[PDB]
Design a binder for these strands. Structure first.
Lengths: 83, 203, 129, 223, 104, 121
RNA sequence: UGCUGUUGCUGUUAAAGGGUUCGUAGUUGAACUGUGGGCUGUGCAGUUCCUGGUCCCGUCCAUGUCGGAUUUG
RNA sequence: AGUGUGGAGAUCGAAGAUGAUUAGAGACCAUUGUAGUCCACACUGCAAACGAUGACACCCAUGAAUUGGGGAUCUCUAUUCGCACGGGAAUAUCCUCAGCACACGCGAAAGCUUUGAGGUUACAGUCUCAGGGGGGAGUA
């Protein structure tokens, strides 16, 4: 997922996270840059084994589309219900 | 899995506890949450949109495995006592009164604290917590008026933040909802404590 | 006074990609605006179009996947001989790997890489990284 | 001084072995707020330090002129990471101290590409980049292998600590002011991880923060 | 040099009027444009309160449920004549922009 | 006449830590000071003993910064015992909670629609 | 020396938008005549038939209104 | 503002006169006063003629307002006035076009912002005007 050497050796220093809204890389120096981990649920309403986590870039929180963007993602993920 | 859908008691309470009513005016955001007007001018919130933001919040919080990470705040007296007991039942840390600028961003201080998550009553009257939450990579879960500035606010629940009764439910419904998930409370029955126990003091 | 209908088209795509929009609605579609977009779509920098009929000049609605850094038009449309791909590769593209320069050739609108292999030269239209 | 007492969760996970590298701290974008986080993670014999500029600065008061010394430090492993701190003091020796520190607090990842077929190890910046600290912006262009660093005296050092062997530059502005020139080249080196190249588009799978996995190990250290 | 006001001290934006016939200044005579000049509308009592009790006493018709007349005048001041009279004073940069308008 | 933060502060540690000092008497509340406190000078205690009685006396007026350990009775003075009350006093046992013409159009669109015991005006 | 700037400058305040409008030489100038098909073998993405792991229906309770279970359902 | 020929000539008023002020002071202040200020017909074209911001086109988020025109209400429908310039006038809610104005990004900074100085080293929508250290000099 990074630039590979002709010999196949992965050359990257690290592979940054990408905003799940804007698809922008999250930079080391970006201090909004949130993860939001929603606990995944199963019947009877108990938490088990929840991997679904959102990444939002510093840009987007400061305009206040973080909320609008997390509605869009949780709906594509099915964590939410349109009605 | 139709569980964590709202149901007739949930709705009644809000409709009874008036959490569904907004301030007269309106921000750009928090329009999708607003439903129509009254003749008094107030805005009315979808009980649907409101609700799903609650379990979403509650799913964020039940995914915090050390509840001393979560940090609940307000500067509003009306939201001071609600903070308090919610923080007991769920376990969360809490700070009311006047948020001291610098608690998140000053190392050397002793009162320095590093939460994962923040919860704020009011996105206005707490701008000092949200702001510094933006320096330290802290997601935010805010109870929001129709007005609330959503700057740096990742997950916003529509509510009455005004008035004592309206807030106390909204932490009462969270803690109830959070605990139906974590900490094993019996979903089949009404829960133990009383809302009366989340309300502001004055003698 | 719409001088170039690509100039207007690819700015909007450019300046509405910089804002993170999920879709753009572009005012005057044209045979060149489509063929340019279908080159963007070949390399993965745009999802989908709708070309809507107004009976006059369409309106393109493009789904952005977030992968465009910029879209230019080169306005006077300078020529390229197949030896001149190195100027344009050098001046207008960020690296010698991942950019693309779009040309009009006898064979049509195509990349500078689709052109080197077919050996045509032509006139420059724009770029996208 | 003594064995030193971590003030922040990440300083704790650093002092315990359970954060082993900066690229874990860089990935989950986190403030490095206490420098000894750097001294652990980078093996020594690697970090290398110099002072770019030291110049006196004068607040006008009644009577004389209060003079402070503003000082710029530059730190990096000649692979990857670089940082540039700039601090002030009432005398040089103090300024050089605080500068040494703030350079370790600001270390930032640098990306390294090729100019051509990808062979051996990366010698250059992957793409054209600018950064601008003032009137003065410093453009960094990829370069064929072996050209060497083409740049002023000052950005040669900043570019040598980051590990870039081959780059062409040009710097517009008033470049005489090394306050800005030093941060402008730096801000340009930052952007090398901001830019999304078709390589980097595929879904990564999320991971959990170090302080979220080890949150338990943190609560027993706090409490 | 530096612009001190977005407004340039006028009620006149660019692409509005362009001329605005000038008026004389109360107290001075300075001609200034009717936008520039600082207006105040006054409504002043003819008589000081302790002078009213005297006269309001001495009158057959006046002074019970009926009051005395007042002096009604607008005043338009040169920006110099206004500062010297203290009707307006300089204000700190942060506070320069405040409009009282009329509210109650 | 004005007391330095040193007088102010130490005197807040006494009242925080001693309820032996009670009477509004400067003289009683003084003789408890000097044995317990070492300020090395008299005026300090004379100041401290003067302000220490301001604090105590005022405590009877209401709360004062550096609040006493009596908060135990303060807190638990909250008596949560009520019939239900408010929550189910709100449904008012067959008396529908007031609901607007919209908040009806809210409910009738909801899947849940209108929860029982809900009226309009 | 990107201090002559096509690549490549600057013009609110540093030097620099004509006081406004009309207007010739000159430069620039909107969309359209236009996804060619079918057959074979092979790589991709979006209705036969088989699942019983869901919600809906229903049952039992009835619970004044936030239990539920129930088998074929 | 000037200039030319006729008119007009109330007010104010370059030049001028007089009294004060002042070490001096036609200055600033006061009483005056000519050209002028006003008008018609001709010239002049010399402004901080300013938004110190060329013209045409596109993209661009928010809150309360405002002036024209139009539409709906006759989920928003409603208020006050009552042949005669009137099946009307204004208002309220909402929308809309067109005008003057009170988040990104950029900028040396002051600041600018769907009324750009934004969308520019990731440099390219079109035409045009002016600038190239300060003086000398807008002079010869």
């Amino acid at each position: 997922i990074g630039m590979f050497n002709e010999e196949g050796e992965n050359v990257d220093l690290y592979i940054p996270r990408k905003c799940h809204a804007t698809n922008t890389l999250i930079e080391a120096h970006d201090h909004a840059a949130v993860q939001i981990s929603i606990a995944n649920v199963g019947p009877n309403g108990v938490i088990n084994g929840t991997t679904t986590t959102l990444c939002i870039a510093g840009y987007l929180r400061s305009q206040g589309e973080s909320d609008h963007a997390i509605n869009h993602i949780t709906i594509d993920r099915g964590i939410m219900r349109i009605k | 899995s139709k569980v964590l859908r709202m149901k007739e008691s949930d709705a009644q309470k809000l409709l009874a506890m008036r959490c569904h009513i907004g301030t007269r005016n309106q921000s750009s955001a928090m329009k999708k949450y607003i439903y129509g007007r009254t003749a008094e001018g107030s805005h009315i919130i979808d009980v649907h949109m409101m609700w799903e933001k609650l379990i979403l919040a509650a799913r964020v919080i039940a995914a915090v495995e050390n509840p001393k990470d979560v940090c609940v705040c307000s500067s509003r007296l009306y939201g001071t006592r609600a903070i308090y007991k919610f923080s007991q039942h769920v376990g969360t840390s809490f700070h009311g009164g006047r948020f001291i600028p610098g608690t998140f961003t000053n190392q050397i201080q002793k009162k320095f604290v590093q939460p994962r998550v923040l919860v704020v009553t009011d996105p206005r009257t707490d701008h000092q917590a949200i702001r510094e939450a933006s320096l330290v990579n802290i997601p935010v879960i805010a109870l929001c008026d129709t007005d609330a500035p959503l700057e740096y606010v990742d997950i916003a629940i529509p509510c009455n933040n005004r008035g004592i009764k309206s807030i106390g439910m909204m932490y009462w419904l969270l803690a109830r909802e959070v605990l139906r998930l974590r900490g094993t409370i019996v979903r089949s029955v009404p829960w133990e404590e009383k809302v009366d126990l989340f309300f502001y003091r004055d003698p | 006074t719409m001088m170039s209908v690509l100039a207007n088209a690819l700015r909007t795509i450019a300046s509405a990609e910089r804002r993170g929009k999920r879709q753009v609605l572009i005012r005057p579609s044209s045979k060149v605006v489509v063929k340019f977009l279908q080159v963007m779509q070949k390399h993965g920098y745009i999802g989908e179009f709708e070309i809507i009929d107004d009976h006059r000049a369409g309106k393109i609605v493009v789904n952005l996947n977030g992968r465009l850094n910029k879209c230019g038009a080169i306005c006077p449309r300078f020529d390229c001989a197949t030896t001149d791909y190195e100027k344009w590769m050098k001046n207008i593209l960020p690296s010698r790997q991942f950019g693309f320069v779009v040309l009009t050739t006898s064979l049509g609108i195509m990349d500078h890489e689709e052109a080197r292999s077919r050996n045509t030269g032509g006139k420059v239209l724009g770029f996208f990284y | 001084e003594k064995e030193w007492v971590p003030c922040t969760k990440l300083g704790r996970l650093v002092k315990a072995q359970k954060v082993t590298s900066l690229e874990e701290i860089f990935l989950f974008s986190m403030p490095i707020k206490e420098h000894q986080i750097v001294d652990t993670l980078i093996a020594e014999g690697q970090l290398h330090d110099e002072m770019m500029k030291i110049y006196p600065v004068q607040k006008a008061t009644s009577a004389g002129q209060r003079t402070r010394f503003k000082a710029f430090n530059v730190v990096g492993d000649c692979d990857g990471h670089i940082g540039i701190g700039a601090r002030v003091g009432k005398e040089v020796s103090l300024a050089i101290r605080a500068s040494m520190i703030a350079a370790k607090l600001n270390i930032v990842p640098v990306r390294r590409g090729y100019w051509g077929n990808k062979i051996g190890e990366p010698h250059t910046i992957p793409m054209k980049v600018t950064g601008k600290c003032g009137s003065v912006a410093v453009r960094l262009v990829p370069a064929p292998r072996g050209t060497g660093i083409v740049a002023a005296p000052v950005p040669k050092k900043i570019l040598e600590f980051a590990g870039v062997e081959d780059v062409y530059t040009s710097s517009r502005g008033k470049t005489r002011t090394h306050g800005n020139l030093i941060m402008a080249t730096f801000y340009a080196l930052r952007k090398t991880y901001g830019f999304l190249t078709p390589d980097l588009w595929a879904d990564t799978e999320p991971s959990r923060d170090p302080t979220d996995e080890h949150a338990e190990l943190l609560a027993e250290m706090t409490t | 040099m530096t612009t001190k006001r977005r407004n340039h001290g006028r009620s006149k934006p660019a692409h509005s009027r362009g001329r605005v016939k000038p008026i004389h200044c109360f107290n001075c005579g300075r001609l200034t444009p009717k936008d520039k000049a600082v207006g105040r509308f006054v409504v002043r009592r003819m008589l000081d309160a302790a002078s009213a009790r005297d006269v309001a006493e001495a009158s057959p018709v006046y002074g019970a449920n009926f009051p005395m007349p007042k002096l009604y005048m607008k005043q338009r001041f040169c920006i110099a004549c206004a500062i010297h009279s203290r009707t307006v004073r300089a204000r700190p940069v942060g506070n320069r922009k405040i409009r009282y308008t009329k509210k109650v | 006449k004005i007391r330095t933060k040193t007088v102010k502060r130490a005197s807040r540690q006494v009242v925080e830590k001693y309820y032996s000092k009670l009477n509004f008497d400067f003289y009683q509340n003084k003789r408890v000071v000097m044995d317990v406190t070492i300020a090395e000078s008299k005026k300090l205690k004379n100041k401290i003993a003067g302000y220490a009685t301001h604090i105590m006396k005022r405590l009877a007026r209401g709360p004062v910064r550096g609040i006493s350990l009596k908060l135990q009775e303060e807190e638990r003075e909250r008596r949560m015992d009520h019939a239900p009350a408010t929550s189910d006093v709100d449904k008012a046992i067959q008396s529908g909670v007031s609901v607007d013409k919209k908040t009806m159009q809210m409910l009738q669109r909801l899947e849940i629609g209108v929860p029982r015991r809900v009226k309009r005006a």
